[PDB]
Design an enzyme around this catalytic site. Structure first.
Site, PDB file in Angstrom:
ATOM      1  CE  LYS A  22      -2.325   1.874   3.498  1.00 58.62           C
ATOM      2  NZ  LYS A  22      -3.333   1.774   4.580  1.00 58.62           N
ATOM      3  CG  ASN A  23       2.429   2.611   3.240  1.00 56.19           C
ATOM      4  OD1 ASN A  23       1.414   3.291   3.018  1.00 56.19           O
ATOM      5  ND2 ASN A  23       2.619   1.958   4.377  1.00 56.19           N
ATOM      6  NE  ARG A  91      -3.444  13.133   9.761  1.00 54.66           N
ATOM      7  CZ  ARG A  91      -3.057  13.288  11.027  1.00 54.66           C
ATOM      8  NH1 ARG A  91      -1.863  12.845  11.417  1.00 54.66           N
ATOM      9  NH2 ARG A  91      -3.846  13.911  11.898  1.00 54.66           N
ATOM     10  CB  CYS A 115      -4.296  22.259  18.082  1.00 52.59           C
ATOM     11  SG  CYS A 115      -3.429  20.714  18.510  1.00 52.59           S
ATOM     12  NE  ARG A 120       0.223  20.953   9.482  1.00 57.57           N
ATOM     13  CZ  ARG A 120      -1.086  21.156   9.330  1.00 57.57           C
ATOM     14  NH1 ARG A 120      -1.671  22.204   9.904  1.00 57.57           N
ATOM     15  NH2 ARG A 120      -1.809  20.320   8.589  1.00 57.57           N
ATOM     16  N   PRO A 121       3.215  17.736   9.929  1.00 58.94           N
ATOM     17  CG  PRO A 121       1.108  17.019   9.297  1.00 58.94           C
ATOM     18  CD  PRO A 121       1.873  17.502  10.497  1.00 58.94           C
ATOM     19  CB  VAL A 122       1.563  19.895   5.505  1.00 59.25           C
ATOM     20  CG1 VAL A 122       1.570  21.030   6.538  1.00 59.25           C
ATOM     21  CG2 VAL A 122       1.486  20.422   4.098  1.00 59.25           C
ATOM     22  CG  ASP A 123       5.119  22.599   8.742  1.00 55.11           C
ATOM     23  OD1 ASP A 123       4.046  22.870   8.151  1.00 55.11           O
ATOM     24  OD2 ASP A 123       5.372  22.979   9.910  1.00 55.11           O
ATOM     25  CE  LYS A 160      11.997  18.179  12.898  1.00 53.82           C
ATOM     26  NZ  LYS A 160      10.675  18.770  13.284  1.00 53.82           N
ATOM     27  CG  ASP A 305       5.939  -0.460  10.223  1.00 56.16           C
ATOM     28  OD1 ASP A 305       5.355   0.104  11.184  1.00 56.16           O
ATOM     29  OD2 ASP A 305       6.307   0.157   9.204  1.00 56.16           O
ATOM     30  NE  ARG A 397     -10.306   2.451   7.979  1.00 60.39           N
ATOM     31  CZ  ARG A 397     -10.796   3.358   8.817  1.00 60.39           C
ATOM     32  NH1 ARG A 397      -9.989   4.006   9.658  1.00 60.39           N
ATOM     33  NH2 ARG A 397     -12.097   3.608   8.813  1.00 60.39           N
TER      34      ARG A 397
END
Lengths: 419, 419, 419, 419
Positions: A22-23, A91, A115, A120-123, A160, A305, A397
């Site tokens: 899936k990845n 996401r 929040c 963050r992720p999108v960054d 990162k 994993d 999923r």
């Protein structure tokens, strides 16, 4: 609320065909936005996220069809905006941004109400696109990227390590003007697969799988037929299923080389292992596994994993073994569930000290982690009596009909409903 | 390429008057862009950055004058851009952004080029602003922010403690509609000072100094007189000067409360310390300092900016001292230089083990860091013979005429020009 | 005070014969204390630590003689103490403790005055012995271990991976009654070598090189001949020498398998590499190396010990490369020296951003670290002009006559006595 | 198997009298071993550990009895050893060690075995003692300490902040010859209380409560009456019970100063708090709590022991709030239980994202953690319906009759006698 009702003990043995990862399928599906010609994507699993991606793609003006293959025709993409309703449960949807801007000069992806600001992720994605010459437009709840003509190749140093941002940057770089260098790129087999896909379309990429990916931009990407790589974790799960039940199994459609660490680990547990270019065999010879010592670490070392699966192995193995999570925190939620099944263990700091027991006892258990969840199902397979695993939508999923695969392996398993 | 030629040993004793903190003056100068009426900023040091800021302010249409005070009239701000030419040597320039968008609805600052993504300072500023409702654009080498009407108060959770973004978010929030709450706010005395300044203008702020700042937006800020707080690191630098030379010193125009941890450390070193409302006295009674253990951490705990100074201290102290750096990576450059002066130490991981020696010897030394550099000058003062500290421009930029302050204390130091 | 005077630039090319590893020779020398029959240890380098070990062994009542080999006859050990002086210049001395207790039932080694309770090197060794049934006796600067009869095999879980303690526990476990399992065992090629040596004496050890070592105790160890493994880091230093000099070199008495990560990293720099059973060839074909991205991590990943050498490579390579240190802290202390040579670099957090330049300018330089120091000599070989590396005694500690090796490769280098 | 049954929802209001801190009582009972005259320890809670400590003391030859007080007469102490039959169930047993060797010249405490070594709790106690001049004897299962005459004052640097080792060193140092200094000492109110106890006995101590404790040894300790400080965590648990229920509670026999961070956080949630010398009042005014941001850290920062309690607070507060745990690794076991109760929370790394729901649903829950368990019981109180918390024996060990306390507040709780 769907549940798995397992009746053990039962020996897991036979054959299993491994589904596409899936990845790898996800980033490749988004990368198909770059393809000026029809594309056939083979070995795409039947999963929720795949459905969500197909809809998203259609929403952009892409022609999409599926089965084992997912047929994509993106010669004519017209809508450059991924809406809230469509990105809400996924996401990975951020993956539409780069291809859109690189190929069309513009892209817009809706973002969820958050929040905390910072890291963050999108960054990483946004800033990676910015290094490539994209103009960024930010408003709470969305991100817009645009460029006049082509993106410009750049030298990028990732502070990162990010699988996500690596796909975004590498994808958009294939159409940029010049050479793009990505330092500190994720090394995952899925990143290698995505890069190979691009190269099959006419992309110029090298270094995939190392700390440094290099991209020479080209004018356009064509079309073609591409086979998505086997799901490495799914494969590991099935190997463990035989390894803990004194069984013998053969994994069809696998890729031995994305599992060096896991295979070596299994051998340490006394498993009899054989590999072919596209298959893997595991034989316990009716024997109980030997406890092992495991330290999870970044690819190509032992994968986090596979953690829950291996903890299970130790819990029914001969002897005492310790599992250490060297990067991640709080990865043992599930152990209390196994302990309720009659396991002998101690969670200590970032480790789990495992005391192997002869037989587990069925119980009513649950876990939210995909892997941990899957491990509970394996536990149900070999435990004495009836086990009921709640909330298996988690497993649904990431695993392509695990009940059917397990059943052909000899498992006594039923998908049962409940309030 | 200026250098300091020092001749020791010289006992550092007498009096010194502490300068206003550059790091409190900067954010305050920028915040003045919010003031509708004339403002007087007292106790502002004569430093390069102050000059660069005044020029920036002038360019925005601000009427700017200076002496001890800096006079500002920002009633008629007519320009909204901070160009490359005016911000190249000054990160702090990002501070013009929030005040501009909050008061004027538009603002833009030139962004110095860079290749790494993630950890980038500006990131938190952008995010705080976006949270407040601003539209952010990353284009043309600039960071652009705009809003139609007023900013909107918001509940912001900082993923990381940022002195810079705390100031940007705090400042802009004073003119926003509603209440803004900043979680995990930087605690620095410079932050309290900036807050206090805002309040003097009519702003509604509380919690400054704690990890939670609450801002009540108002319609407009006025004018007034405000005195910038004393430079705590400068104060600490002078205190240590007497502590390592057996001397006695009185620091005028100082603020005891911003130095709790440093004062306690000095007492451990065996210093006789007295304090008043605006003064601090240190008396070695002619005695050699005792070794101390130092652990840097976020304010109000032991400051990393006093680290190199304290290392110097342990180095001529009685006993073995330990210096541990938890804030910065690679903050020990002064050590190899000190060792060349006769000092003894081992660097293990993030700590320095100090073996205090009776006396230091003159040598040719150089450190790029501001604090380490001033430390070298101090060591020159107490070392036997001649010491030549190279590249002193670093000190010129962060210390107001340090040579003059040191000389009045009894130092034998001269500024050498040429090479 | 010895120093190296280097005349550059010179292409390093030809042959070099790799020395045995000090790091495997040491623990093997100490382990010989277990042998009831004479032992021949070949391929032992001529280094200070080897001498100290030889003196220490003789002092125990051991018969010792050296050349390329070291002859040991441990048949008549009668003194059970390692005096203060021998242990002060050498941590490795702690290695005499285990064999002594395991074989003789008693042992004692001197201890350097404490520093900070908790987290001393010696501790892990102590606890491991205790786990094995030994009685421990302590006092500031004294550690006695003893047992009545045989040590007892135990299941030991290491909370910290330690090369030193792993050797201690493994060595002492060969003579204990029963099975000893070491969880979280250090994986170093040196650990493998030591374990192999033990097995050559008649010990039962499996798992060497993995996370889990299992030892089955036996009544006694005989004698024999053992060849210490090649020095992996020296081998790497030589490979880099050619790679940064457009040269071609062949490493003799090499062990390719202990260098996977370094070899693959050299290929990324553009190097042409071939390997055989006991050799390794590197060929730049007259080309400048390509900038690489490096991430130091636990064996078998990229070794922090090759760091300075690679930083050097990136400094003279085509393009930009970032070296990231995840191991130690403060591992870049030598970079300023490179900058003085005309290198372009930025130290950020735990990384060094390298901007390769065409040619280095000779200069007067110095680093305390073994690796960084050798790297300065390599730099002298390729820089334009004369380079003087000061305090090369550091190099002498881990390098067997490096000047003769370099010269044999074509380097213009002189060992200048004191000055 | 004892269990708790709760009928909800119910507003928790009124009064509660806080018990003495078990954590202060323990180290104090041990330090009483140093007393040459009778000692009366007041405000000691009636808990298991206290019983075990009493049994332990009696076996040494101490005359001991209890009610509210515990009376100690260490005049006939003629047995210097704590056997496994006691220490087995109580880690704090290590506390007899220091007082024993300091007063009597000898002491021996039994040690629980285990596979793990390195990072062991008891290690720091052994090291501190050794620093004081004690001779240490070890063997798996026992640690022995002895000294010729008095212990010797020493300057000690704690590698890590340890509550246990700080008490041990401080305690033994009171009878040592000379001055003892503990660097990086734990700051807990419990340590302050033990120091105060010692001082009332005639010891010489200062700096308790700060990172540096100074102890001037004296000849002997007398006797007296001493009142154990209030249980800070118990008080916190009570304040929370009112805050999550619109109630008003007054905590009697409390000490406000030990709860700075918790009080500030409660105010953050919208609580109307008042304090006096020995009482704390919390008033919600029938209002629901506001989500808060929490970061655990070392005393005087936010306590990890208040962690689970605050998560519950968030889970029923208006909005989203994040709890970040930095002290302990797997402290999230309470979340899955709370979810079953109708709570919305996401676990990510070392933090928990909370989604304030209006109300919880009765259910059958179980947590092994003292704090998490107490939290569930609190949950049951405000949740609609009936809740059954299993294994409430954990609560029994740290909370003195929690049901009576809750019942008096308005709760519907019943102890249920299992199976």
């Amino acid at each position: 609320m769907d549940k798995f009702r397992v009746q053990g003990p039962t020996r897991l043995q036979g054959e299993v065909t491994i589904s596409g990862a899936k990845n790898a399928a996800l980033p490749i599906l988004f990368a198909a936005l770059l393809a000026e010609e029809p594309v056939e994507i083979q070995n795409v699993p039947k999963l929720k996220d795949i459905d969500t991606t197909m809809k998203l793609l259609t929403q952009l003006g892409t022609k999409v069809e599926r089965x084992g293959s997912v047929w994509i025709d993106a010669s004519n993409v017209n809508n450059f905006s991924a809406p809230y309703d469509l990105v809400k449960t996924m996401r990975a949807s951020i993956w539409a941004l780069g291809p859109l801007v690189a190929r069309f000069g513009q892209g817009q992806v809706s973002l969820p109400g958050g929040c905390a600001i910072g890291a963050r992720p999108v960054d990483l994605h946004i800033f990676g696109l910015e290094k490539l010459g994209a103009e960024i437009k930010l408003e709470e709840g969305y991100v817009k990227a645009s460029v006049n003509g082509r993106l410009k190749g750049a030298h990028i140093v990732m502070d990162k390590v990010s699988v996500g941002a690596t796909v975004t940057i590498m994808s958009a770089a294939t159409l940029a003007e010049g050479t793009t260098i990505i330092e500190n790129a994720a090394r995952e087999p899925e990143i290698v697969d995505t890069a190979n896909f691009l190269v099959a379309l006419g992309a110029k990429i090298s270094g995939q799988g190392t700390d440094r990916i290099t991209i020479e931009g080209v004018e356009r990407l064509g079309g073609g037929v591409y086979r998505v790589l086997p799901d490495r974790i799914e494969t590991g799960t099935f190997l463990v299923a035989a390894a803990i039940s004194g069984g013998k199994i053969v994994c069809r459609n696998a890729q031995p080389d994305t599992l060096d660490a896991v295979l070596a680990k299994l051998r340490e547990a006394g498993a009899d292992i054989e590999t072919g270019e596209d298959w893997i065999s595991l034989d316990m010879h009716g024997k109980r596994p030997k406890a092992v010592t495991v330290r999870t670490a970044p690819h190509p070392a032992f994968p986090t994993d596979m953690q829950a699966q291996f903890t299970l192995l130790n819990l029914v193995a001969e002897g005492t073994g310790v599992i250490t999570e060297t990067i991640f925190e709080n990865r043992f939620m599930h152990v209390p569930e196994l302990i309720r099944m009659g396991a002998h263990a101690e969670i200590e700091s970032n480790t789990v000290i495992c005391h192997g027991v002869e037989k587990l006892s069925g119980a009513q258990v649950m876990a939210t982690d995909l892997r941990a969840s899957a491990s509970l199902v394996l536990a149900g397979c070999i435990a004495e009596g009836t086990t009921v695993v709640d909330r298996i939508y988690h497993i649904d999923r990431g695993y392509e009909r695990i009940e059917d695969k397990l059943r052909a392996l000899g498992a006594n398993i039923e998908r049962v409903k409940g309030e």
